[PDB]
């Protein structure tokens, strides 16, 4: 047959050259984008944004201690160990939509509220703990996860989540674009949970 799609070849060629953020279409007023790390790992690094009607340190507490207020799937949670005033081992479970197993998490988080220019950050990465035993389905691997919250406007914040998770056992042809949408919706829910509703 005759149909040259060297086009789809030429895009895949220019993306390989590029090492920064590739933007996406995103619903419900969010900014999505991705990035190939050049890792030797197919998994993309994603970056979602929103403007949220609350000052940074509030938004930070909303992500850090109040996620039952914005995630209907967020089920079992416990601080597993406290390492210092601002770092800990946290363990939660997320329930899954279809008859799948649950995605499970055990993470080192540290957070920071006294950064220059009113900035706050929460950062996470998966670990194992001698006391955090499979609370259900499938251990994920938070390879990267970082919330950057910065002041924009009068008592409002720009919330940005850059992450890269390896849930263990779905298609690479699913984390190609579908995962990004899940990120943009997490960050939209956080926003919604500060709207009189």
From Swiss-Prot:
Expression sites by tissue: Ubiquitously expressed. Underexpressed in hepatocellular carcinoma cells and some breast cancer cell lines.
Subcellular location: Cytoplasm; Membrane; Mitochondrion membrane; Lipid droplet
Domain of life per record: Eukaryota
START domain span: 1-197
Cited function: GTPase-activating protein for RhoA, and perhaps for Cdc42. May be involved in regulation of cytoskeletal reorganization, cell proliferation and cell motility. Acts a tumor suppressor in hepatocellular carcinoma cells.
Assembly and interaction partners: Homodimer. Interacts with TAX1BP1.
Protein name: StAR-related lipid transfer protein 13
Species annotation: Homo sapiens
Record lineage: Eukaryota, Metazoa, Chordata, Craniata, Vertebrata
Gene of this entry: STARD13
């Amino acid at each position: 047959t005759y149909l040259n799609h060297l086009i789809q070849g030429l895009q895949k060629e220019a993306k390989e050259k590029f090492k920064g953020w590739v933007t996406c279409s995103s619903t419900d007023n969010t900014d999505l984008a991705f990035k190939k790390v050049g890792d030797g790992n197919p998994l993309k690094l994603w970056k979602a944004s929103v403007e949220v009607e609350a000052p940074p340190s509030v938004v930070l507490n909303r992500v850090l201690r109040e996620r039952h207020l914005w995630d209907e799937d967020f089920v079992q949670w416990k601080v597993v160990e406290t390492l210092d005033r601002q770092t800990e081992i946290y363990q939660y479970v997320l329930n899954s939509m279809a008859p799948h197993p649950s995605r499970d998490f055990v993470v080192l988080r540290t957070w920071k509220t006294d950064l220059p220019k009113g900035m706050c950050t929460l950062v996470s990465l998966s670990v194992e703990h001698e006391e955090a035993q499979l609370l259900g389905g499938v251990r994920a691997v938070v390879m990267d996860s970082q919330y950057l919250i910065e002041p924009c406007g009068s008592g409002k914040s720009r919330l940005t989540h850059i992450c890269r998770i390896d849930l263990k056992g779905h298609s690479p042809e699913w984390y190609s674009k579908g995962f990004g949408h899940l990120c943009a919706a997490e960050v939209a829910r956080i926003r919604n949970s500060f709207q009189p509703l």
